[PDB]
Amino acid sequence: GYVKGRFYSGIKPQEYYFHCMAGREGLIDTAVKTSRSGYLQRCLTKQLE
DNA sequence: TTCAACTGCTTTCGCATCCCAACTACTTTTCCTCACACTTGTACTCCA
């Protein structure tokens, strides 16, 4: 998966497929990120009100 | 001096049995159109 191609000249189909793998690894991490810090701040602000 | 159930909490707006009907039947509603049995003379002779 070492892409020697550049976006100016376009990338080959093998290295097009690996670059779609790196494009989905960030989008799946947002998909596991539903509700994280909304209840941490509520617990602090109720005591420290 | 510990095991095991009862325990409230993850966000931030807005999105998002009874009834009905089918078709074919049979029937009622009545009103209209005539016949079927009875009877006295008259006719054709009947017996006097």
Swiss-Prot record:
It is found in: Nucleus, Nucleolus. Residues 13-25 are annotated as: Bridging helix. It comes from the Eukaryota. Coiled coil: none annotated. Belongs to the RNA polymerase beta' chain family. Component of the RNA polymerase I (Pol I) complex consisting of 14 subunits: RPA135, RPA190, RPC40, RPA14, RPB5, RPO26, RPA43, RPB8, RPA12, RPB10, RPC19, RPC10, RPA49 and RPA34. The complex is composed of a horseshoe-shaped core containing ten subunits (RPA135, RPA190, RPB5, RPO26, RPB8, RPB10, RPC10, RPA12, RPC19 and RPC40) where RPA135 and RPA190 form the DNA-binding cleft. Outside of the core, RPA14 and RPA43 form the stalk that mediates interactions with transcription initiation factors and newly synthesized RNA. Present with 2840 molecules/cell in log phase SD medium. DNA-dependent RNA polymerases catalyze the transcription of DNA into RNA using the four ribonucleoside triphosphates as substrates. Component of RNA polymerase I (Pol I) which synthesizes ribosomal RNA precursors. Besides, RNA polymerase I has intrinsic RNA cleavage activity. RPA190 and RPA135 both contribute to the polymerase catalytic activity and together form the Pol I active center. In addition, subunit RPA12 contributes a catalytic zinc ribbon that is required for RNA cleavage by Pol I. This is DNA-directed RNA polymerase I subunit RPA190. It comes from Saccharomyces cerevisiae (strain ATCC 204508 / S288c) (Baker's yeast). The lineage of its organism: Eukaryota, Fungi, Dikarya, Ascomycota, Saccharomycotina. The gene is RPA190. The chain holds residues 980 to 1028 of 1664 of the full protein.
